[PDB]
Amino acid sequence: NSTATLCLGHHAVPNGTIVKTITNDQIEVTNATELVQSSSTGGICDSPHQILDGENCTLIDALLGDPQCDGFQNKKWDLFVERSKAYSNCYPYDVPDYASLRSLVASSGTLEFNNESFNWTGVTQNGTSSACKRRSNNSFFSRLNWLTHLKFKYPALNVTMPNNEKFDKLYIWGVHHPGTDNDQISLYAQASGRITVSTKRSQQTVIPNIGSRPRVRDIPSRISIYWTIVKPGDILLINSTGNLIAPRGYFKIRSGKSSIMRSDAPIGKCNSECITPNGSIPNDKPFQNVNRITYGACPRYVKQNTLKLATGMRNVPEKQTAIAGFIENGWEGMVDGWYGFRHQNSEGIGQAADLKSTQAAINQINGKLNRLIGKTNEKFHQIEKEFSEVEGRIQDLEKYVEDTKIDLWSYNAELLVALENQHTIDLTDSEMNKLFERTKKQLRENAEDMGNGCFKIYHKCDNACIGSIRNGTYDHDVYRDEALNNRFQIK
Amino acid sequence: NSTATLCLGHHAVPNGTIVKTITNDQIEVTNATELVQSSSTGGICDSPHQILDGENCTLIDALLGDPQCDGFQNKKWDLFVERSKAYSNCYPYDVPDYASLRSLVASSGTLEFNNESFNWTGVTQNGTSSACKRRSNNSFFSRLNWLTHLKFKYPALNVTMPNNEKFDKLYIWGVHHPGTDNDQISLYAQASGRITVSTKRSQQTVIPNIGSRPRVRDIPSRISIYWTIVKPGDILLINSTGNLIAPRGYFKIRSGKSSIMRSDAPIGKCNSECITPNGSIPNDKPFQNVNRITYGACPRYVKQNTLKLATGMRNVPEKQTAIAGFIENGWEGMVDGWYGFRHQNSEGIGQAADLKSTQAAINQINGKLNRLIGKTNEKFHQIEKEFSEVEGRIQDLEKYVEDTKIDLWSYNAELLVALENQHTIDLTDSEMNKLFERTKKQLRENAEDMGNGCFKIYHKCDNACIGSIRNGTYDHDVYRDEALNNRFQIK
Amino acid sequence: NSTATLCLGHHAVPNGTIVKTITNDQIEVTNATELVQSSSTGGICDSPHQILDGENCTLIDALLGDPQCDGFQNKKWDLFVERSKAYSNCYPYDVPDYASLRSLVASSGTLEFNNESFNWTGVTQNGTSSACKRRSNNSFFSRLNWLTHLKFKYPALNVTMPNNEKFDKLYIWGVHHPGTDNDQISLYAQASGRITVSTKRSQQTVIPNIGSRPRVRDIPSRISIYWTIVKPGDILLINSTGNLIAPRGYFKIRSGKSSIMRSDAPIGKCNSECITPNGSIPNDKPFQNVNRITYGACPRYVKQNTLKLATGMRNVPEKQTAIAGFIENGWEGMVDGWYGFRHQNSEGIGQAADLKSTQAAINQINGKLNRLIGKTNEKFHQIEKEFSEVEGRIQDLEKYVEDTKIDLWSYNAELLVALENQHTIDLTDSEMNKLFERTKKQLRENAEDMGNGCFKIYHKCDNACIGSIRNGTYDHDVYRDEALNNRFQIK
Ligand SMILES: CC(=O)N[C@H]1[C@H](O[C@H]2[C@@H](O)[C@@H](CO)O[C@@H](O[C@H]3[C@H](O)[C@@H](O)[C@H](O)O[C@@H]3CO)[C@@H]2O)O[C@H](CO)[C@@H](O[C@@H]2O[C@H](CO[C@]3(C(=O)O)C[C@H](O)[C@@H](NC(C)=O)[C@H]([C@H](O)[C@H](O)CO)O3)[C@H](O)[C@H](O)[C@H]2O)[C@@H]1O
Ligand SMILES: CC(=O)N[C@H]1[C@H](O[C@H]2[C@@H](O)[C@@H](CO)O[C@@H](O[C@H]3[C@H](O)[C@@H](O)[C@H](O)O[C@@H]3CO)[C@@H]2O)O[C@H](CO)[C@@H](O[C@@H]2O[C@H](CO[C@]3(C(=O)O)C[C@H](O)[C@@H](NC(C)=O)[C@H]([C@H](O)[C@H](O)CO)O3)[C@H](O)[C@H](O)[C@H]2O)[C@@H]1O
Ligand SMILES: CC(=O)N[C@H]1[C@H](O[C@H]2[C@@H](O)[C@@H](CO)O[C@@H](O[C@H]3[C@H](O)[C@@H](O)[C@H](O)O[C@@H]3CO)[C@@H]2O)O[C@H](CO)[C@@H](O[C@@H]2O[C@H](CO[C@]3(C(=O)O)C[C@H](O)[C@@H](NC(C)=O)[C@H]([C@H](O)[C@H](O)CO)O3)[C@H](O)[C@H](O)[C@H]2O)[C@@H]1O
Ligand SMILES: *[C@@H]1O[C@H](CO)[C@@H](O[C@@H]2O[C@H](CO)[C@@H](O[C@H]3O[C@H](CO)[C@@H](O)[C@H](O)[C@@H]3O)[C@H](O)[C@H]2NC(C)=O)[C@H](O)[C@H]1NC(C)=O
Ligand SMILES: *[C@@H]1O[C@H](CO)[C@@H](O[C@@H]2O[C@H](CO)[C@@H](O[C@H]3O[C@H](CO)[C@@H](O)[C@H](O)[C@@H]3O)[C@H](O)[C@H]2NC(C)=O)[C@H](O)[C@H]1NC(C)=O
Ligand SMILES: *[C@@H]1O[C@H](CO)[C@@H](O[C@@H]2O[C@H](CO)[C@@H](O[C@H]3O[C@H](CO)[C@@H](O)[C@H](O)[C@@H]3O)[C@H](O)[C@H]2NC(C)=O)[C@H](O)[C@H]1NC(C)=O
Ligand SMILES: *[C@@H]1O[C@H](CO)[C@@H](O)[C@H](O)[C@H]1NC(C)=O
Ligand SMILES: *[C@@H]1O[C@H](CO)[C@@H](O)[C@H](O)[C@H]1NC(C)=O
Ligand SMILES: *[C@@H]1O[C@H](CO)[C@@H](O)[C@H](O)[C@H]1NC(C)=O
Ligand SMILES: *[C@@H]1O[C@H](CO)[C@@H](O)[C@H](O)[C@H]1NC(C)=O
Ligand SMILES: *[C@@H]1O[C@H](CO)[C@@H](O)[C@H](O)[C@H]1NC(C)=O
Ligand SMILES: *[C@@H]1O[C@H](CO)[C@@H](O)[C@H](O)[C@H]1NC(C)=O
Ligand SMILES: *[C@@H]1O[C@H](CO)[C@@H](O)[C@H](O)[C@H]1NC(C)=O
Ligand SMILES: *[C@@H]1O[C@H](CO)[C@@H](O)[C@H](O)[C@H]1NC(C)=O
Ligand SMILES: *[C@@H]1O[C@H](CO)[C@@H](O)[C@H](O)[C@H]1NC(C)=O
Ligand SMILES: *[C@@H]1O[C@H](CO)[C@@H](O)[C@H](O)[C@H]1NC(C)=O
Ligand SMILES: *[C@@H]1O[C@H](CO)[C@@H](O)[C@H](O)[C@H]1NC(C)=O
Ligand SMILES: *[C@@H]1O[C@H](CO)[C@@H](O)[C@H](O)[C@H]1NC(C)=O
Ligand SMILES: *[C@H]1O[C@H](CO)[C@@H](O)[C@H](O)[C@H]1NC(C)=O
Ligand SMILES: *[C@H]1O[C@H](CO)[C@@H](O)[C@H](O)[C@H]1NC(C)=O
Ligand SMILES: *[C@H]1O[C@H](CO)[C@@H](O)[C@H](O)[C@H]1NC(C)=O
């Protein structure tokens, strides 16, 4: 009746989701996406990383050449997977600083071994044992050479092996600790004497220690395992009078991205960049709470089991019912846009979405998704994060380093999502406010703000007229005389 | 005189506090709260954690059973407190990797000890010394057994102890290093020979080393202390020909939240969750600069000695004097609200607080206090952070880890408080602006904005009329004819 | 023609720079500054830190007193610089835990050495070798004393040295490992026997190990180096029957800010607070990507090679052409201010800068530059971050600690610059909006907002009138009758 109403509004949905911002612990938005990966398939995918399943073998057992590990000879890996069921089935041994040798071989990523012709003149080679059977026969570690007396003599060994290669050589060797004095004489024909293995730059002396240890596979003796790395132009010197478990050659030692993981997860024929002990996980999300132990391009481990990123505006119920605008009121009936117009005029009541404002909001939200989704970074060999034995100081430090790191990342994740969500609420509120202001400015003196997100337009404004406002081509001068007469009359 | 004035405003106080935001290094606000705890009472509260005051005993001395520590037998703790006055008063000893044994016992949290019947047939037991008196008599460590020759014989010991329990056993044992060859013969009846202590999975051999060390309590000999952990189903084997300081049994080893702290603070009868070497501290605040060493639910250590969180709006002086609104002007006379109205009309000049806006600001500020106050997280056994000896590499790493951590937290604290304070300034400014806008919209064409946070209302507006605006029930149509005539007249 | 136009605007430049905000991956601003230092001069400046260039000497060689290092005697440093060309030229030696002794001497920062008169009665002193020539003559390490038999006797040494000083003493000593049994007898007149060096609180026993090692300077023997620190009131006891390489006295050990760095950069006569292996770097910027290894007041190492901080507003092209204001439009022709006014009236078209708004923006931007520029913090002795040998566990941890730290700082840097840039865009947009609003409020009913950042002023407004608006002294009442007649006429 000589006027029209034009309301600005935004959509609302019946099934909103709660997120956290800086302003609110809980605010309902139209939509959100999860940023913490909390599940795994349960299998380790065999692609795209080269996986070596240790099965019954530890890495160190595959290194030394336990008979059940013969199939591992010379293999390489990106990730060596050690199973909890693994067990040793050869001569009982220990490795002082086992963890370091495991780590350096793991990180090298290869079991490539080159045989060398050592001069073992004057002794018997290839000693074997019933504790280490190969094909039903008494045998020994494939890569080691148990030397013993020859005709009750064991002449002093003083043997040399130059490295004339352009790469480093890793030598694995050992010392036999016999159970009794009888065994020492039976084996080496004399009282026990130290072993010295040296290079130009380093030396290691080891003393065999005769004595009973608890029997393992009926063996009260032990072998202790040692290693030496020899640089190009340097030379290995082995100097011994008995009890030497000699190397048969050297391992290549490489540098690269290889590592080792303890897991019982089955290996599957599938493709996934991120491996955890629980299985591979998708790496679309920036964070994960599956496992602190990871390999490959992985989300960062956090303590939270959920962090929701807002991907829509505040969700506001529609007040019950004349048309009304956005002030404390969303429009559940607007489904083809995020923002729009409702009008009442001589021709009826209508709605239309505003594409520009809708797309501006969507684009910005898609931008922040692009920065956070699918952007994980790769890590490879790290530190151990679970321990089967009590050790004290070094382990305390490894644990504290990891705890420190996780708490700092968890804090960053918490803040980032709160900040981002606050920004999303702000940018979507801003698009609504900007649409209102643009409309107010078009209308000039021809309308008044009713306080509810609507304008009272003080002239006849048919569908085409409303359309012109929505399209930004309304000419206020055309209607100003009519509007001013209607506004500034005296009733 | 046919018009009225209505001003919107906010409170101000005579005693503001300076805070830091993103926008300003220094901005005065009405109120702030401290987020860094910088004082302690000076006492360690004996509740709610179980405290064991070591008094004159170190943990290791209480473990071995120095006579002054007899009262500690079998005790447990959450926190063992070692005093700087502590001193050893038994046979002089050392512990290779003392720090690891201290840590693992500390973390276990128990001195529970179970005696075992070892077969020491063929030797003399219970050797004692004047360096270790108990009840005026020559004695020895309670948990160790000094074995010596019997009738000038010391037969080879080869003794076994199975672990048929479902828990791990910790064995503490030692090697006696005599001062002279005479002492070696006097004690063990033969030349010194190695000691080997083994299990199915591990072995340790130790060689006694005869020689003078500087006398301590007139003793030039030493004992070196070692330990072995034995798993269920495994067995301890002790193999020796002399110089054995034998175990009398095993310690339980537990897992849990126990630790150890160096402090001289007195223990008080009080209750506090957070313990530092300086004493317990309140844990209401999120940060603290009392000590990097903490136990329990503690604020995080930061370098800052103060960080002030704004808990009110910007504090703005009242300009000297017609009434005026919030533009560059606070109202020191408004004491029953944070925001409000002042008016001038035919009936006088008045003020009233606006409850809604005040409560909206207060609630949001209380929300952020709730997130930051009383929300500390517990940490228990960590790494050492002060050192009495120079050590090199491992200590360099422990120090760098802690320095790294503190700098990262200090940075997070600095940013968080700057961000939060900026947000508080923004939300309180926003409540003022929203109140102004709501009022502007009610008034429609009946008022004009004077530019100083006040409206000139162009009609007679008595106390009830002003009240209607404040209460949001003002009907602009009632007054529009009057107002339009007054506004758009020609003077 | 009875009206005027007044536009509000902001400057724009032809050569903008792209930065990152929270809202935009790429937004062009008028100006930016770099926060990551990415270059070095290539030289280490000799001021203000005390630099000691090791030249051909390692620290350990200068400690022991290799003849080519005689010039280093008693020197101090803030930073010891070790060169890759360095080489040893004396008796072949090793140091078990070399890295720890290097670190503790490096951190101490002094080679001050005090000679002491040990009682070496009964042996020959000052043994020398052709492997260690000094001034063409056979010689030895300056700080060590090679003792050998006297008249084919080597009586048991049992020598004492009390520390009656108020500071700690560092003793460096060694054990000679002869190449053959012949050398052992030639040198010490008897079979090899252990060396024991002790104090009241500690003990070290070392066993000489006879054997061939690969010849170095024709020497198949080795010396192994050890150290002992003696506290005030404690005493050094040296107990040996041969193979002792004895100390000639002690090194002072100090605490302070000294360290050691590997670098081949030349030392220059210049002044710079921050040293890296690549050379000194300026420390104005908060971050750097030159080297993770630093000494002194240094920017923090990050992975990014550039991070640009906005130092101006959004840069917006001027739309082509009536005058127009800031809505989607910058003014390339405004060069004496950041914000200003353009007008059209009876006297022409003019421009003037607004000083207040310009200065408000500049001051705030200068504030944030002041917080970020020239504010670096000092670090001194840290951990090693590059390694020439494979080691396993400890090295894995040192690497993981550093990687962790760098990733956390890189994240903080990324967020900080995004937040700061968002804040800069917001504060500069805000100054534009505030200027517009202040002007709108002055004009009251005498103007209408044209929607393009300009006002249509509905009265004659000559240069002085425009000036009054700009200066904030425009009196709207003077013109209101004229303006209202022009606005609310009927055409
Ligand atoms: C080297 C050897 O075979 N040792 C056997 C050992 O042999 C001695 C024994 O037969 C006596 C009997 O009088 O004779 C000695 O020979 C002397 C001879 O009398 C004299 O004329 C001459 O001048 O001097 C020689 C000394 O050289 C024999 O030396 O017998 C004992 C008791 O039966 C064996 O102990 C048992 O070992 C069992 C495991 O057997 C192996 C194994 O591991 O499978 C056999 C391997 O061939 C042998 N390996 C090598 C490289 O020799 C190993 C090795 O000896 C041990 O593993 C070391 O711990 O033993 C099983 O452990 C059982 O429980 C033992 O009682 C011993 O092996
Ligand atoms: C084991 C013992 O008591 N050792 C004494 C030692 O005893 C020898 C001495 O009396 C000579 C004298 O001729 O006789 C020897 O006996 C031989 C005998 O002649 C011969 O017939 C027979 O066939 O062989 C035996 C050898 O077994 C004795 O062995 O005397 C010296 C010098 O007086 C003592 O040194 C002094 O020790 C003082 C501390 O005394 C204790 C202690 O710590 O309290 C007494 C303890 O009972 C003893 N503990 C045990 C378990 O035996 C310890 C222990 O020996 C030391 O602590 C080891 O370092 O000593 C104090 O240190 C003083 O300064 C020393 O001069 C030695 O203890
Ligand atoms: C101590 C010494 O000079 N050792 C020489 C060694 O001397 C023995 C040799 O001349 C025989 C010959 O019959 O005689 C021995 O003397 C005995 C004598 O016969 C007997 O009557 C008496 O009762 O007993 C003595 C034993 O004390 C000599 O002891 O000769 C060998 C072979 O020539 C030398 O080896 C060579 O060493 C070369 C390096 O020489 C130095 C060096 O480093 O410069 C000389 C230094 O003076 C010496 N330092 C000291 C403190 O003595 C060192 C030191 O011995 C070595 O470094 C230890 O490794 O050697 C070079 O290495 C060459 O390749 C070797 O063949 C040996 O040095
Ligand atoms: C030191 O004490 C050890 C523990 O008592 C002892 O170990 C053990 O020796 C016995 C036999 O001497 C083993 O028992 C085996 O012997 C029969 C003999 O034919 C075999 O048929 C069986 O396999 C039987 O198990 C024990 O297994 C073994 N115990 C342990 C824990 O290792 C050492 O022999 C003693 N050492 C010396 C040098 O005497
Ligand atoms: C190797 O040298 C050591 C240092 O000189 C020496 O240590 C000491 O020995 C003396 C006695 O021999 C102790 O002095 C004590 O002796 C009288 C004798 O009755 C007592 O009354 C007093 O208690 C007096 O203090 C020293 O205390 C002691 N010094 C140190 C630093 O330990 C060793 O005895 C020598 N070793 C050998 C095997 O000869
Ligand atoms: C154990 O084996 C070692 C390696 O074969 C051996 O080392 C070396 O000994 C030879 C001489 O015996 C050195 O050669 C030098 O000898 C002549 C003799 O006049 C000199 O003119 C030259 O300097 C020549 O180089 C080797 O340099 C040396 N090789 C290494 C790698 O060190 C040991 O001698 C053997 N040990 C025993 C105890 O026999
Ligand atoms: C909600 O958000 C996510 C991410 O933008 C999108 O993939 C999903 O389809 C959205 N859901 C709805 C119902 O719009
Ligand atoms: C591993 O050992 C188990 C148990 O001894 C055996 O049954 C299984 O066949 C073994 N697996 C492989 C792959 O050798
Ligand atoms: C090393 O070899 C030499 C002979 O070349 C010999 O005399 C010596 O005993 C050997 N050393 C050891 C520790 O076996
Ligand atoms: C993965 O395994 C770890 C270690 O056993 C366990 O703590 C965790 O609950 C597992 N997580 C998932 C998602 O299966
Ligand atoms: C200031 O703030 C704190 C925390 O909100 C509050 O406990 C205190 O009483 C306030 N002081 C005043 C004077 O309002
Ligand atoms: C601890 O030792 C001191 C000094 O010897 C003694 O006076 C005090 O009584 C001792 N305290 C306890 C609790 O045994
Ligand atoms: C261990 O016991 C055996 C006898 O069972 C003995 O012959 C041997 O000497 C002992 N070993 C040691 C190192 O004491
Ligand atoms: C607590 O003790 C530490 C360590 O001695 C000291 O540096 C610090 O000043 C103390 N802090 C307080 C608040 O007493
Ligand atoms: C741009 O910014 C920097 C830092 O404020 C300033 O030093 C430089 O001179 C500025 N450049 C221009 C062209 O204004
Ligand atoms: C260091 O050694 C090189 C190569 O032997 C020599 O030429 C140079 O003069 C030496 N420099 C110094 C400072 O002694
Ligand atoms: C230490 O000195 C004593 C004599 O005082 C001597 O008997 C003993 O052999 C020496 N010990 C060593 C390990 O050299
Ligand atoms: C500095 O040296 C390091 C280590 O060699 C190298 O990686 C880096 O590229 C260098 N940086 C610059 C800016 O020269
Ligand atoms: C062990 O040595 C024998 C000779 O005794 C040789 O024939 C054989 O090749 C060696 N065993 C190997 C290489 O497995
Ligand atoms: C030490 O052994 C004796 C027998 O020599 C025994 O009676 C006593 O119980 C033992 N001492 C203890 C358990 O304290
Ligand atoms: C080594 O001892 C000799 C006496 O044999 C002495 O004259 C000389 O000063 C000592 N050498 C030094 C201190 O360099």
PDB file of C-alpha atoms in Angstrom, chain A residues 22-23 25 94 177 209-214 216 222 224 303 389-394 396-397 400-401 403-404 407-408 411 422 436 448-451 456 458 487-491, chain B residues 100 103-104 158 194 198-201 203 205 229 235 237 239 300 364 371 379 381-383 385 387 391 394 397-398 401-402 405 408-409 412 416 423 441 444-445 480-481 484 488:
ATOM      1  CA  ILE A  22      38.005 -17.401  21.217  1.00  0.00           C
ATOM      2  CA  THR A  23      34.703 -15.708  22.182  1.00  0.00           C
ATOM      3  CA  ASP A  25      33.556 -22.376  24.403  1.00  0.00           C
ATOM      4  CA  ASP A  94      74.037 -59.911  23.507  1.00  0.00           C
ATOM      5  CA  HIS A 177      82.545 -66.147  26.364  1.00  0.00           C
ATOM      6  CA  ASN A 209      85.001 -63.701  30.431  1.00  0.00           C
ATOM      7  CA  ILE A 210      84.707 -67.396  31.207  1.00  0.00           C
ATOM      8  CA  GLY A 211      81.710 -68.392  33.285  1.00  0.00           C
ATOM      9  CA  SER A 212      78.328 -70.038  33.525  1.00  0.00           C
ATOM     10  CA  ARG A 213      75.307 -68.063  32.346  1.00  0.00           C
ATOM     11  CA  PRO A 214      71.791 -69.538  32.524  1.00  0.00           C
ATOM     12  CA  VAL A 216      69.642 -70.918  26.551  1.00  0.00           C
ATOM     13  CA  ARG A 222      77.545 -66.304  25.275  1.00  0.00           C
ATOM     14  CA  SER A 224      79.014 -60.495  22.692  1.00  0.00           C
ATOM     15  CA  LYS A 303      46.371 -35.239  22.725  1.00  0.00           C
ATOM     16  CA  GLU A 389      63.201 -52.221  29.837  1.00  0.00           C
ATOM     17  CA  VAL A 390      63.862 -49.773  32.669  1.00  0.00           C
ATOM     18  CA  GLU A 391      67.046 -47.734  31.934  1.00  0.00           C
ATOM     19  CA  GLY A 392      67.053 -44.419  33.861  1.00  0.00           C
ATOM     20  CA  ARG A 393      68.683 -41.251  32.574  1.00  0.00           C
ATOM     21  CA  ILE A 394      68.756 -41.571  28.783  1.00  0.00           C
ATOM     22  CA  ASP A 396      63.964 -40.262  31.005  1.00  0.00           C
ATOM     23  CA  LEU A 397      65.297 -37.705  28.504  1.00  0.00           C
ATOM     24  CA  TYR A 400      60.597 -35.922  28.311  1.00  0.00           C
ATOM     25  CA  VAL A 401      61.558 -34.720  24.810  1.00  0.00           C
ATOM     26  CA  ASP A 403      56.134 -35.361  26.067  1.00  0.00           C
ATOM     27  CA  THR A 404      57.363 -31.772  25.647  1.00  0.00           C
ATOM     28  CA  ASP A 407      52.186 -30.771  24.650  1.00  0.00           C
ATOM     29  CA  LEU A 408      53.496 -27.902  22.491  1.00  0.00           C
ATOM     30  CA  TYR A 411      48.599 -26.285  22.441  1.00  0.00           C
ATOM     31  CA  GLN A 422      36.729 -16.979  15.389  1.00  0.00           C
ATOM     32  CA  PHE A 436      23.064  -4.763   4.459  1.00  0.00           C
ATOM     33  CA  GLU A 448      14.309   3.608   6.514  1.00  0.00           C
ATOM     34  CA  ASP A 449      16.038   0.925   8.577  1.00  0.00           C
ATOM     35  CA  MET A 450      13.376  -0.916  10.634  1.00  0.00           C
ATOM     36  CA  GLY A 451      15.929  -2.315  13.129  1.00  0.00           C
ATOM     37  CA  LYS A 456      10.799   0.046   4.816  1.00  0.00           C
ATOM     38  CA  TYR A 458       8.624   4.374   1.000  1.00  0.00           C
ATOM     39  CA  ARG A 487       8.285   9.626   4.577  1.00  0.00           C
ATOM     40  CA  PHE A 488       7.942  13.231   5.567  1.00  0.00           C
ATOM     41  CA  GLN A 489       4.208  13.662   5.621  1.00  0.00           C
ATOM     42  CA  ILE A 490       2.226  14.691   8.703  1.00  0.00           C
ATOM     43  CA  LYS A 491      -0.331  12.120   9.871  1.00  0.00           C
TER      44      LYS A 491
ATOM     45  CA  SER B 100      70.268 -43.750  36.510  1.00  0.00           C
ATOM     46  CA  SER B 103      66.121 -42.084  38.838  1.00  0.00           C
ATOM     47  CA  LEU B 104      64.755 -45.577  38.404  1.00  0.00           C
ATOM     48  CA  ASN B 158      77.948 -70.295  41.455  1.00  0.00           C
ATOM     49  CA  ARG B 194      86.149 -61.052  38.307  1.00  0.00           C
ATOM     50  CA  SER B 198      73.805 -62.848  34.684  1.00  0.00           C
ATOM     51  CA  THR B 199      70.333 -63.741  33.553  1.00  0.00           C
ATOM     52  CA  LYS B 200      69.025 -65.457  30.424  1.00  0.00           C
ATOM     53  CA  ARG B 201      68.905 -62.044  28.690  1.00  0.00           C
ATOM     54  CA  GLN B 203      75.245 -60.237  31.811  1.00  0.00           C
ATOM     55  CA  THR B 205      81.197 -58.793  34.617  1.00  0.00           C
ATOM     56  CA  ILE B 229      66.580 -56.506  37.048  1.00  0.00           C
ATOM     57  CA  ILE B 235      66.876 -66.471  36.836  1.00  0.00           C
ATOM     58  CA  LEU B 237      73.126 -66.333  38.413  1.00  0.00           C
ATOM     59  CA  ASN B 239      79.447 -66.389  39.781  1.00  0.00           C
ATOM     60  CA  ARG B 300      53.917 -23.870  33.417  1.00  0.00           C
ATOM     61  CA  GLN B 364      32.630 -13.212  28.280  1.00  0.00           C
ATOM     62  CA  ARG B 371      39.618 -21.327  30.655  1.00  0.00           C
ATOM     63  CA  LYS B 379      53.659 -33.767  35.563  1.00  0.00           C
ATOM     64  CA  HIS B 381      59.048 -37.723  37.082  1.00  0.00           C
ATOM     65  CA  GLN B 382      60.880 -35.621  34.510  1.00  0.00           C
ATOM     66  CA  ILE B 383      64.594 -34.948  33.869  1.00  0.00           C
ATOM     67  CA  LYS B 385      67.464 -29.507  35.624  1.00  0.00           C
ATOM     68  CA  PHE B 387      73.724 -30.320  38.143  1.00  0.00           C
ATOM     69  CA  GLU B 391      79.723 -33.885  32.574  1.00  0.00           C
ATOM     70  CA  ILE B 394      74.513 -35.666  28.042  1.00  0.00           C
ATOM     71  CA  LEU B 397      71.510 -32.004  25.910  1.00  0.00           C
ATOM     72  CA  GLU B 398      69.426 -32.073  29.134  1.00  0.00           C
ATOM     73  CA  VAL B 401      66.016 -29.484  26.017  1.00  0.00           C
ATOM     74  CA  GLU B 402      64.859 -27.554  29.070  1.00  0.00           C
ATOM     75  CA  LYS B 405      61.003 -25.814  26.227  1.00  0.00           C
ATOM     76  CA  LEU B 408      58.695 -21.902  23.610  1.00  0.00           C
ATOM     77  CA  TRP B 409      56.302 -21.674  26.566  1.00  0.00           C
ATOM     78  CA  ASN B 412      53.190 -18.912  23.931  1.00  0.00           C
ATOM     79  CA  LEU B 416      48.270 -15.659  24.402  1.00  0.00           C
ATOM     80  CA  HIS B 423      40.013  -9.616  22.255  1.00  0.00           C
ATOM     81  CA  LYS B 441      17.558   2.186  15.408  1.00  0.00           C
ATOM     82  CA  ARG B 444      14.294   6.217  13.675  1.00  0.00           C
ATOM     83  CA  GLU B 445      13.662   9.734  12.318  1.00  0.00           C
ATOM     84  CA  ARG B 480       7.274  11.215  14.632  1.00  0.00           C
ATOM     85  CA  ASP B 481       4.983  14.091  13.608  1.00  0.00           C
ATOM     86  CA  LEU B 484       9.763  15.828  12.007  1.00  0.00           C
ATOM     87  CA  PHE B 488      12.864  19.922   9.337  1.00  0.00           C
TER      88      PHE B 488
END
